[PDB]
């Protein structure tokens, strides 16, 4: 009648223990402040108007990228069979993004890139002309 309790995993390292303990506190500090920001300034608009979908924007991709924005967006547009467009001057300090997802449509990849770009760049899609457009901000 040997007694056992269900989760029996691989052994753990105390470095990973300490890293996890720091990460939990980082996560809930982040959660509380995101609550405060959402309450203080409620958003009103959504980037589905600037990036609508189309046929053959529904092919799918899984991506793990940590570089500048232009090469990844060119690869996405070329896979979607669209023309690629750049407006404005690229800044001297590069615009870096970091995407690590699994299995979503190309339109959603583009919208997440658009959200992570922030105040530095923007993405627009014209489906009647089949054009993906990246425009840089007039800053510096």
């Amino acid at each position: 009648m040997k007694f056992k309790k269900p989760p029996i995993n691989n052994p753990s390292d105390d470095a990973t223990i300490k890293l996890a303990e720091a990460a939990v506190s980082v996560s809930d500090s982040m959660l509380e402040m995101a609550k405060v920001e959402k309450v203080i300034t409620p958003p009103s608009k959504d980037n589905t108007l600037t990036i609508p979908n189309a046929y053959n924007l529904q092919a799918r991709a899984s991506v793990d990228w940590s570089g500048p924005i232009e090469e990844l967006t060119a690869r996405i547009a070329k896979a979607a069979h669209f023309r690629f467009r750049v407006l404005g001057k690229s800044p001297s300090v590069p615009v870096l993004i970091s995407i690590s997802t699994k299995d979503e449509s190309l339109a959603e990849i583009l919208r997440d890139i658009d959200y992570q770009a922030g105040k530095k760049a923007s993405i627009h899609v014209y489906p009647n002309s089949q054009v993906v457009e990246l425009r840089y901000a007039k800053i510096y």
Binding site: A59, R60, A61, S62, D64, R75, A79, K102, D103
Partner: protein
């Protein structure tokens, strides 16, 4: 020299030639033109009769293909699925998309070190053979995995 690496890790030319030869005798078509590589798989060796459900024994073949794909260095892979004409255009477009989604997920679960995997399903739009008498036994219902070797 003793502390720099002397080759890309886990990779050997004899192993590449051996596995390419074994795959060609088994029946999976492996071709290379320039630096582009194509692996073409018949759908009967992977799926059931037009359902997106793998057999249990075909995971050994997917494991073998993943062990082949770990030998190179690459940036993007494309997986595209094609089928044969059964009911409408929509049913096989959905079928090929589901098949490509499942296969690319298992390949991503194994450790292929790619940055992007694109998946699409073209239905029965692009046949490579005018003999269309089989069902899923037809030679033009297949999945193709294409990539470019980088440097």
């Amino acid at each position: 020299v003793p502390k720099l690496p002397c080759r890309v890790d886990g990779a050997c030319d004899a192993t590449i030639i051996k596995m390419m030869t074994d795959l060609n005798k088994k029946g999976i078509k492996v071709a290379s033109v320039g630096q582009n590589y194509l692996i073409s798989i018949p759908a009967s060796a992977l799926f059931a009769d037009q359902s997106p459900r793998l057999n249990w024994a075909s995971y050994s073949l997917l494991n073998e293909i993943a062990a082949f794909l770990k030998q190179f260095r690459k940036i993007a892979i494309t997986v595209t699925s094609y089928s044969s004409k059964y009911v409408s255009v929509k049913r096989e477009r959905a079928l090929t998309l589901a098949r490509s989604r499942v296969v690319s997920e298992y390949l991503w679960s194994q450790g292929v070190d790619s940055r992007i995997i694109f998946t699409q399903g073209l239905g029965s739009d692009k046949p490579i053979t005018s003999y269309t008498l089989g069902g899923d036994r037809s030679p033009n219902a297949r999945v193709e995995i294409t990539f470019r070797r980088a440097v």
